[PDB]
């Protein structure tokens, strides 16, 4: 088998990406964001909070004549944005592009916090990392991807984000169409429950490429590229006016900047982020300092290969009995 659906951005700035998911029977559809960095399936539902859902699609499992409660199963979980959520579990027939999961855990939110109350267009999250990472308890459940891998024609998904734009979601095949050149392969770490994985070095525009070791996580779930002060710095140097800004949180640049671009090794292969891709637009309405799409690590504790470095590439997520992450340009 095999599944693909389209993503799309819920905003004019890619702050994140949403694909349609059906859950239970009939069918009840909700905007998803798809998150490789997280290993839960959770949503807004007739159990949420009302004053915590703000304009959401919620689930009802109650009309769900494939719903079932999971007796005694709870999940709480805390991203590294400082939000949070937490509920009971039901198991029920979700589908993703024609690809069909029979039992799958779905987590059904008791409570949210502000920043997905405040955000009315996303439903929920389905994660992509690793099934380690989930939290159901006492019993841990699996990924939507774990769930259906057996079943899949090849052990992959493939995540292929549009800027300013729509893109897919692959599950069970790599579109031989949707990339230019070759798909460079990279080792991946499972040992944290992410897929983390060794860029090679970057480069700063049309500057010289530097080799050196960078490990980080491919993150759809997260907005921005996050590296190494010593890397971001190099970056922000090139755009007259920039600055980190303790107050803003983060480098700014004057919104009449052009920006430069920033390239990424895979073994030794690159990948090329263009300038654009790297504006975050004005830190406020009206005001002509401009967020930056590139931000500094250090408070982080990992690098954070997000929606600004993987919309460049076409990348797969190989699930194979050993996992690697393939990175080409498009």
Known sequence: STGSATTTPIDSLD?????????????????????????????????????????????????????????????SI?????????????????????????????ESAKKVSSSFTEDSTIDGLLGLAFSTLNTVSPTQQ????????????????????????????????????????????????????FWEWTSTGYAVG????????????????????????????????????????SSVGGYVFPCSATLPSFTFGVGSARIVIPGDYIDFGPISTGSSSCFGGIQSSAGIGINIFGDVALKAAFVVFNGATTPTLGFASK
């Open 206 to 245: 049309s500057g010289t490429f530097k080799s050196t070791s960078i490990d980080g996580i491919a993150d759809t779930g997260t907005t921005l590229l996050y590296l190494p002060a010593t890397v971001v710095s190099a970056y922000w140097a090139q755009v007259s006016g920039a600055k980190s800004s």
């Open 15 to 75: 702050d994140a990406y949403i694909t349609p998911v059906q859950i239970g029977t009939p069918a009840q559809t909700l905007n998803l964001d798809f998150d490789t960095g997280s290993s839960d399936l959770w949503v807004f539902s007739s159990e949420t909070t009302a004053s915590e859902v703000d304009g959401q699609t919620i689930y009802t499992p109650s009309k769900s004549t494939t719903a079932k409660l999971l007796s005694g199963a709870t999940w």
């Open 142 to 193: 699996k990924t939507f991807f774990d769930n259906a891998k057996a079943s899949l024609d090849s052990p992959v998904f493939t995540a292929d984000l549009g800027y300013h734009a729509p893109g897919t979601y692959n599950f069970g095949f790599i579109d031989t169409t949707a990339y230019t050149g070759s798909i460079t392969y990279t080792a991946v770490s499972t040992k944290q429950g």
């Open 78 to 106: 805390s991203y590294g944005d400082g939000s949070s959520s937490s509920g009971d579990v039901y198991t029920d027939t979700v589908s993703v592009g024609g690809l069909t999961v029979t039992g799958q855990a779905v």
